[PDB]
Amino acid sequence: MEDLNFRKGDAKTDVFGSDRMLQPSPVERIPDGPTTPEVAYQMVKDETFAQTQPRLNLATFVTTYMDDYATKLMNEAININYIDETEYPRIAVMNGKCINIVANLWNSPEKDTWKTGALAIGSSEACMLGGVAAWLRWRKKRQAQGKPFDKPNFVISTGFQVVWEKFAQLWQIEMREVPLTLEKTTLDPEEALKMCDENTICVVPIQGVTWTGLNDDVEALDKALDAYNAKTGYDIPIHVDAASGGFILPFLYPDTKWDFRLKWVLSISVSGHKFGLVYPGLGWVCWKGKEYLPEEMSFSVNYLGANITQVGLNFSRPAAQILGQYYQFIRLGFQGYKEVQYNSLQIAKYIHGEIAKMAPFVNYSENVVNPLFIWYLKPEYAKSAKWTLYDLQDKLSQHGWMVPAYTLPSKLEDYVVMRVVVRQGFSRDMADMLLGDIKNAIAELEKLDFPTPTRMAQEK
Amino acid sequence: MMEDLNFRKGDAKTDVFGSDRMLQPSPVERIPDGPTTPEVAYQMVKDETFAQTQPRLNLATFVTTYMDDYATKLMNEAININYIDETEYPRIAVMNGKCINIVANLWNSPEKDTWKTGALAIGSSEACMLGGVAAWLRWRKKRQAQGKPFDKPNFVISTGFQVVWEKFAQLWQIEMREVPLTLEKTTLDPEEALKMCDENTICVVPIQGVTWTGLNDDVEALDKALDAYNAKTGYDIPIHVDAASGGFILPFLYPDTKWDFRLKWVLSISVSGHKFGLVYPGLGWVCWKGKEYLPEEMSFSVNYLGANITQVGLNFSRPAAQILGQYYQFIRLGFQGYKEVQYNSLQIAKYIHGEIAKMAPFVNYSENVVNPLFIWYLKPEYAKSAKWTLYDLQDKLSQHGWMVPAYTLPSKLEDYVVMRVVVRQGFSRDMADMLLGDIKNAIAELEKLDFPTPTRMAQE
Amino acid sequence: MEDLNFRKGDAKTDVFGSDRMLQPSPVERIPDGPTTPEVAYQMVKDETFAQTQPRLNLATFVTTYMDDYATKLMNEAININYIDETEYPRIAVMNGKCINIVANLWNSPEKDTWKTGALAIGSSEACMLGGVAAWLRWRKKRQAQGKPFDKPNFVISTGFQVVWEKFAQLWQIEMREVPLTLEKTTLDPEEALKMCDENTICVVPIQGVTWTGLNDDVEALDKALDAYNAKTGYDIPIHVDAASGGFILPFLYPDTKWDFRLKWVLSISVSGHKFGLVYPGLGWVCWKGKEYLPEEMSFSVNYLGANITQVGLNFSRPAAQILGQYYQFIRLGFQGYKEVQYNSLQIAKYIHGEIAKMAPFVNYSENVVNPLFIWYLKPEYAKSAKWTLYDLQDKLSQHGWMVPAYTLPSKLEDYVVMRVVVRQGFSRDMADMLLGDIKNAIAELEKLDFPTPTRMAQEK
Amino acid sequence: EDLNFRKGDAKTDVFGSDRMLQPSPVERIPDGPTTPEVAYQMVKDETFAQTQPRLNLATFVTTYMDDYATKLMNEAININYIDETEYPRIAVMNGKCINIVANLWNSPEKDTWKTGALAIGSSEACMLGGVAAWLRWRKKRQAQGKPFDKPNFVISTGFQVVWEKFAQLWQIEMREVPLTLEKTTLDPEEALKMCDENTICVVPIQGVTWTGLNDDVEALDKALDAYNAKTGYDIPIHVDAASGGFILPFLYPDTKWDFRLKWVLSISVSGHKFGLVYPGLGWVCWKGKEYLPEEMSFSVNYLGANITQVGLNFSRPAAQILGQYYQFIRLGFQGYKEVQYNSLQIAKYIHGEIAKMAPFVNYSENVVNPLFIWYLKPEYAKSAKWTLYDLQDKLSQHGWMVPAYTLPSKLEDYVVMRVVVRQGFSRDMADMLLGDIKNAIAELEKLDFPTPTRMAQE
Structure with a gap:
């Protein structure tokens, strides 16, 4: 009892025993024919693995975590076009x-x-x-x-x-x-x-x-x-x-x-x-x-019902974020927001303090007013050091972190700095994990006998 | 011997609709001082979305209201991926390209x-x-x-x-x-x-x-x-x-x-x-x-999200889920698959177009349907003696959940009140028979009026 | 390659790219052949969209909401036939x-x-x-x-x-x-x-x-x-x-x-x-x-095991509702029920009070002893009004509500009344939404220049 | 240290609480509430100590539907069918x-x-x-x-x-x-x-x-x-x-x-x-x-405009209508034919295998429904120490429910046993049931004294 169409994609096909998974994903042109959903789901899903995980992305300021109820709430709204305000007048009010x-x-x-x-x-x-x-x-x-x-x-x-x-x-x-x-x-x-x-x-x-x-x-x-x-x-x-x-x-x-x-x-x-x-x-x-x-700047539209008045550059767009924002206001209130942001600021302050104690680092500021801060190498340390903050970024990348290194804007462009952003979902426990990885990376870099490429470039 | 004192205040035993919070209005002007439980906040936001048109019954919109279960799972799993962080997520940037x-x-x-x-x-x-x-x-x-x-x-x-x-x-x-x-x-x-x-x-x-x-x-x-x-x-x-x-x-x-x-x-x-x-x-x-x-x-580059990020666009930070969905559709359907879905939408639009022409009050704006949508209006001979307008038909269908929009055409056809039906994916022949049935039932009820509607009086 | 059976329903078929979704659902006779599960799920599910949503059904007295745990519990009992008491004696005891x-x-x-x-x-x-x-x-x-x-x-x-x-x-x-x-x-x-x-x-x-x-x-x-x-x-x-x-x-x-x-x-x-x-x-x-x-009125059965004695008109039936009722007793208790019904009564009283303040309405009773009440048009207002409560019902239907209008029983058959039922899951927030829709609907109806059909019938 | 851990708070573990040291209510509604997880377990746990539906061979009532029908029906758990003005599409679907x-x-x-x-x-x-x-x-x-x-x-x-x-x-x-x-x-x-x-x-x-x-x-x-x-x-x-x-x-x-x-x-x-x-x-x-x-026909005025229906019950769940219509579309005539054919073949197979066993004789040689009965060979039963009631008890120890009972009037002397083959009962489960019966027969034949039910038969 053999299955003749097993590899072509039929009801018995296992995704990774098929001909499609021996072929590359399309680069230039749409494929002529379809595949099974499981096959297509894997081919797309599998490409997203080889990159930074969102919760370890300390470069972004953009939220990477919401609770289970907000996530469910927004997922249920995935097919709601916000701009159809005549069809969805309750979301238009909620937006307001x-x-x-x-x-x-x-x-x-x-x-x-x-x-x-x-x-x-x-x-x-x-x-x-x-x-x-x-x-x-x-x-x-x-x-x-x-x-x-x-x-x-x-x-x-x-x-x-x-x-x-x-x-x-x-x-x-x-x-x-x-x-x-x-x-x-x-x-x-x-x-x-x-x-x-x-x-x-x-x-x-x-x-x-x-x-x-x-x-x-x-x-x-x-x-x-x-x-x-x-x-x-x-x-x-x-x-x-x-x-x-x-x-x-x-x-x-x-x-x-x-x-x-x-x-x-x-x-x-x-x-x-x-x-x-x-x-x-x-x-x-x-x-x-x-x-x-x-x-x-105000505009009106006639062909989605009786009338819709809008300010904005975009038109059709998802409404899920409106549900999420209103949910956050109700679920947290003023106290809830205050306590969550307090956690992010306190954790940012903590890393800020621990980074200052490390021998190669000096903080750009003594005051932390947002759940983020920057630091750079001590100028005395940098002269004899064989590595730059670009090299430390590469070390942390090997453990999944993304901690970005970049030069400051005009008139401080000589300063290579590194930034950590503490969003909701980044705990004291994750901070200790990052601090340990940084200390270990410093010890490895300090063993170098020759300058890194970025360190040689820095010598003009 | 077992009374819960904080039952109504929102504790671990609270039933959402036995609490004080569900006896209070949702906030209109200011953020609430304090938090609620997730279930309470979930209902207060979710319940406001009930009293409006369901997306699959919105025949006014052109915007997709249905995707298969695998794409939906795929996109919901990407809800926390900011597309613009291309240094962190280079695979989606490649997928975008x-x-x-x-x-x-x-x-x-x-x-x-x-x-x-x-x-x-x-x-x-x-x-x-x-x-x-x-x-x-x-x-x-x-x-x-x-x-x-x-x-x-x-x-x-x-x-x-x-x-x-x-x-x-x-x-x-x-x-x-x-x-x-x-x-x-x-x-x-x-x-x-x-x-x-x-x-x-x-x-x-x-x-x-x-x-x-x-x-x-x-x-x-x-x-x-x-x-x-x-x-x-x-x-x-x-x-x-x-x-x-x-x-x-x-x-x-x-x-x-x-x-x-x-x-x-x-x-x-x-x-x-x-x-x-x-x-x-x-x-x-x-x-x-x-x-x-x-x-x-029109091309720009950014320095503080990693190495280098370059991109054209008005927006910056944005959801990435739609990229995964678009790429998924290309692989899952291919050219043949896309062709078959759009063919279905065009045929269903043609079918409704054909059945609408057979009805006594209606005439179609065009003899050729080249997109999965079409418009029609009242026969001029019928309109003179009729007591109702297409606005009245729109309200009748609203009572059954439909949104079929009525509006005046742009310049030089502004006298023509027309109605539009858009056939998106997820709208089947069976759903068309349901809408046609509701229209015929609505016509018979409207023809029983002895006096003109307000919208009919406004026209003359 | 091209997939030859894409439209016939095979492993690659898209539901709304298939021949089946260009055909109407069966009215008279069972279809000759099968379809795929996804197709059949949509063809049935899609017919349920174009009707009242249960939480907006203010006509019914029957529960439209249970918490997530009660719902999960009852869904897991979907295949338990209650009457098999020899097989399921624990539910038989639970019933007692x-x-x-x-x-x-x-x-x-x-x-x-x-x-x-x-x-x-x-x-x-x-x-x-x-x-x-x-x-x-x-x-x-x-x-x-x-x-x-x-x-x-x-x-x-x-x-x-x-x-x-x-x-x-x-x-x-x-x-x-x-x-x-x-x-x-x-x-x-x-x-x-x-x-x-x-x-x-x-x-x-x-x-x-x-x-x-x-x-x-x-x-x-x-x-x-x-x-x-x-x-x-x-x-x-x-x-x-x-x-x-x-x-x-x-x-x-x-x-x-x-x-x-x-x-x-x-x-x-x-x-x-x-x-x-x-x-x-x-x-x-x-x-x-x-x-x-x-x-x-009592009977005994010999073929499901030892002996089963039952009073009742029905025999085989689902058991989930027994689990649901017992869950509610344990989960809420006397205090919990009291708190839920109090919420429903207070919300009904509140809507009852707001309806009395409105110019066209007078309440059938001044005391609300169940989470429900009826009202009618002030007789002086009704004489000069161009609309009846039947017209108000259709207006609210256009926003998804179902609020029933009907004539009272014997000796009050001349009275057209409207009823609102406040069940668990209908919050103060939803009451404000309903009341807002009613006030807006009243403003629309008072703009009529001629009487509605139902208003002409009342002049008898 | 959480002071209210046992009373039911946000940190309470279901089975570290005072409530799970207390009995479920028998006579009176409890005075106060508990947490949902606690109440969910207290009800769910009572359903364990009874026959599992797929092993319930006494019932004729469906114990399995596919995942899509189940999801479809679960999503309709809050739809009262009788409100036809509110849900007119289901009224048509029912028709x-x-x-x-x-x-x-x-x-x-x-x-x-x-x-x-x-x-x-x-x-x-x-x-x-x-x-x-x-x-x-x-x-x-x-x-x-x-x-x-x-x-x-x-x-x-x-x-x-x-x-x-x-x-x-x-x-x-x-x-x-x-x-x-x-x-x-x-x-x-x-x-x-x-x-x-x-x-x-x-x-x-x-x-x-x-x-x-x-x-x-x-x-x-x-x-x-x-x-x-x-x-x-x-x-x-x-x-x-x-x-x-x-x-x-x-x-x-x-x-x-x-x-x-x-x-x-x-x-x-x-x-x-x-x-x-x-x-x-x-x-x-x-x-x-x-x-x-x-x-026999009646009309109501207070749910919508007018609702006319024939029936003893009024308000009821609508999920079964969705399930039935789904089954008609999903299977069709060919699909129904194949499912019932499977159930009849499995019933025919067990019926044939039951006849080969020394203690059993079938009440009929023709199987026209996915169920059949059999009884002890009269010659075997006279010298046997056990009845079919005892075999029922033997099979119960492995989770099966195979009912033993006496036939109606003029055959009331016949104690019979019945197996019903519903959808969801496979050839593999039939082999499992047949093996358990053979093992149970060998155990019962080792008896030296008659069982209680066997003495009552004397």
Whole structure:
């Protein structure tokens, strides 16, 4: 009783006894014919094995863990198109309720029950929407005064996230960067105001800088910007890129004035899928009032029912992240968020302290205000050391970690640093595992008799 | 002898619907002060999703509402994979590129590079904007080189455009020139489009699968008409095809229809992977005819997620599950498999199209169904004496869970109230008989009215 | 390679790329051949989409939610046939323990450890067993007295559940109905006694009338019946139809005398699958003592093992509901049930209160004693209104709700009422959603310029 | 240190708690609640010490369905069927099942929606047919001026208990036709001798529970035609086809037993036996609309607009309707034929192997349903120290339930044993059962003294 079609893929075929699993996956062209689901499931699934596991990815800021109930909740929503708001009006309201909670978390003074804000895939779309809003407000203002409005610019630290580089390029807007130095490790207000002019649409301080993990002083900028705006009448506003810190500061630092409590903060953006505790696909942008979102940016659609009004760059998109965000708000509340972020900050502080005790390392800062920090080699140690932080990254890669090594932005580009991000799901126990692996890697690297390639490059 | 004092407060013995929390409203304005149990929070969010249309009964949407069990398992397992971390997850980055290769070859790309030029997108929205910005930037580069001005760009499109092109016009301040629809000209006529083209026209946008009508603009006729215009003027006006729906229908069911990179002036094409690419929401693709048509400005590199990460796109951090799903579909189905599924959707649309024409009040907008969707409206003779409109039929079907949208057509057909049915994968012949039965039952009830409906009165 | 049997249903077949999904489901005859399991699962499952979701069914009294553990427990018992008591003696014992708990909940004075009662599919069979028991007791009595017993009759309010009409027709027993008035909204004893005679087998007061949500005064009926029986010697007993109230009164109204505490209450029936919190398929009937269950009604079986004795109309049946009921008793206890029913009552009271504040509505009763209530249009409002409650029902149906509209029983047949049932799994949050939909629906209906069909019929 | 570990908190281990040192409630509802995991175990653990369903060879009711049907039915656990206004698609699906069943039984009815009703099992299905035959008979006798106060019906002594309930609960006289070795099923002439003007119907059985045989319906229909022509009593047949209703159309299509016969006006079956659905399914069909009394139909006003249905039960689970419709689509005629063929072959195989054993003799040489009975060879039983009750106890020690019982009237001296082969009982499980029996026989033959049941037989 032999099965004639066993290898061709029939009801009796075992996946790894088949002809298809002796053939490579398609690179250029769609295969002419189908295979069984099990076969196709393995061929795709098996390719994802040979890469970093998400919970050991310490490079990313983006959430890699949610509890079983949120995961089930979002998995059940995998086939819900959010933009079909006529079909799914309850999710449209839930989305709006999330926006209100976020805006109230940021101390919005807006009295409308439905606060002014928009859903986003991440900080990318959220930041671009805020910038286009400031651009359109600025163009509208300059026309009324007869001044020209064909050469806009915006000011930001060199520790900017790449999305602002897209914003500059894709909208042909000039980016004016304020460099980083050891004396000024975050955005200095004086240095920023010297680059402001009549064509500056906004200044972008960052809460949770990706390169350094620090917070630009938003209140000091608001203080400096008030005198400058009174002196020139340029009426230059602030937009806060709070991609990380937006869900950290309200709970752990409620008294730090950085948000809509400030006069010149007219809009804020955050990544819900970073420290908003939601799986990838969530960003928020809120405005201080209805008047700061230009009427031009609102749109209406007729062929999904009676009417849908939207702000946003994307249209059709998954709704699962909205369910996840609302779940997180209800499941945790203010206390729950506070305790979870406290854990991430405490664990980040702990690694930060243990890294400082190690002979080759020195921390870029003495204060840890986000669940992330950077460090580099002691300059005295680096001169005689045969390895760089790039080599330490490779050692940790062999145990599954991804701890990224990179050079700092402009004027600190000589500094090779390493960054660790502590997200929810990274415990004290996992930190001890990482610290042991780092110490072991240092001992192995210290036995080298010759410099590594990266160490030789560093000698110019 | 065994009373639980904290039963209602939410402890280990609490029943969700015997607790105080389920006697309280869900938060609208502010985050709750404290937490609840996971089961409580799961219900409060999940229960709000009940009172709306079920996705398989949403005949308004084009976006996939069904995938097989293996793809669903595959994508749910990828819920915590951030695609953009390409240093951490290089295999999905390669898989993404292999998908782009497959799509570009599906569209008959002549590019000889193994890695075709294209980019991942959340949907047709981002894909179209990237294609439009690409056409904008090439045109700017041309006008600068020739000393001509480049401060007043425009693009041409039919009035049956999808809303994303209006966003493109508004958010980039680019002029949209619309070609109206008539009963004589139900799709984009090339001659009328050419009348609106000039030295400042960055591209013309024909649509494959017009959302309003389900028809295809004749791309080749446009390409031929555009070639004569460009030869006379030297304006070098290219085509970008908005193939949101038809992009995954035409290669399989109409392989010889010349509409893609086989045409001289088709320099880029966009499609929604989450419509007839058969993937859950969150997927769009855009391809360019060659490497030279994607401006160097549109490419960017990031330093702090690992070694080097380079990618075109508006979004950054995003879910990766849709990439696994799209690649899964290609292997699982192949060309034959895709062909068979789309054939089913087109046949079922044709069948409903045929049965709708047989009904006394209805007439179909077109005699040819080339996409798995179609529109119809009331017979003018019937409409004069009828007391109801298609809006009333929409509400009747809503009582049985259906969403079949009624709307007025775009410019010059705005007097026509039409109804649209979209046949996606997961919508069978049996489900069509159920909908047709509900329509016939709804007609008989509506014909019993003695007075006109409000919507019927508004019309006259 | 091409797969030749892809559409015929083989190992590579996609459900919605197959010939079967281009064919209608069988209406008249069994299909000649088989299909694949996935195909058959979809063809059946897809038909269930286009109807009310159970949690939005406010018409039903039957449980639509159980916790995850009860559901898992019952699903694991799907293949256990209860009647095989020799094979499954532990469930047979478990069934008897449930009967004991119910009888003690109703203050049974029976001294036997194993109380007298029987399992039922629902209130239907439970009521018929109680009625047939009362019928046979009366037959035995009239034989002893030499009186005739060929013309039996029972008394009940016009607000009876249809099972009593089944009992009357299927057993050819005369039903004598006591009408409802606004002065007498429940079964009045004086008028009820007027229909009693020597041939009355029992009177059936109802706890939780389906039409109104009210409770017949069992104690007042028992008091009048004690005097009547002393004067006539007819020996008329009570059977309480407590389908709903049977699981409400012991927890929320323990001191309301209505059960076996009364002299003439000889049997009681209830729906376990309504407010006993069990999925469909559970009913209980209890007698005050062994002497009130006629020996004729009991039977023994020889072919499933040793000996099996049963009272009941059904034989083979699922056992999961017994496991579910016993689980609920252990999991909740008295406090747990009390807390769940209190939530359901408070939510019903809350909706009841909000409905009274609305301009078109007036409540049938001011006191809510079951998690249900009815209301109708204010008569002054109804005269000038263009819509009826039937029109409101269809409006809510368009959002997925099912809220039933119907005419009341005898002497109130002119009254169109609407009923809302608050079961476990219907939260305060869902009540706000429902109320919002009603307010919005009222605003839509008041915009009518002409009366609806149902409104024209009411002018009679 | 967690102070409330034993009281049931977030850290409590189920079996380190005070509750698991306490008995399950017997008389009264517990005063307070417990955690779900605790309550789940307390209920689940009581179900262990009894027969496993796949080893329960006494029952006729399905103990296995495939994974897709099981998932389909589990997902419908909260759907009350009777709310047809809310769930109109299931009401149609139920009617489509009734049409398929009636056409399976060769209904001559021309109406698209065939005449029939849903039932929890053969119990409710049979009673609905009986009440229908009772009401038709009353209506007939009223028109003729004849009396209608003393009805009776005729059935074999091998009746299933639901007919005794019908007799008792409706006060209708049951006239029983005894079983003999000469007449192993309902003999038609003996049945006719007990009929009179007060006979509402005769009940032949397809799949007798005691014996596994089929009453000859055509012979009854032929004999009843002559009797009805002679008397004008107009006595009809109702077939209790609880088991055979889903066997005969597929494996014996040419056997005339159903609506092809003149006097078969109604048929009932158990969907949860050989209809291949989990417990909770029965069907009754009538030959035409005229044979279902208008009195038996009812309408409700408070669930939706109007709901009309025929049945004893009202609210009930809908999962069995989904399961039945799935089975019709998934298997079809070819699929059903193959499954029942497998069950019959396995029954035939065990029957043959049982005959080869020294102590056993089969009650019949023909196996027409996936079940059969046998008893001890009379010569062997006289000198044997054990009965089939003892063999039942032997097999129970390995988890089997193979029931031993005495036959109905006139064969009450025969202690028999029955094996039912449902879907999910394979050739491999049959070899396992046969091996256990051979081992049990060898153990029992080593007895030196008679068992208690063997002394009672003396």
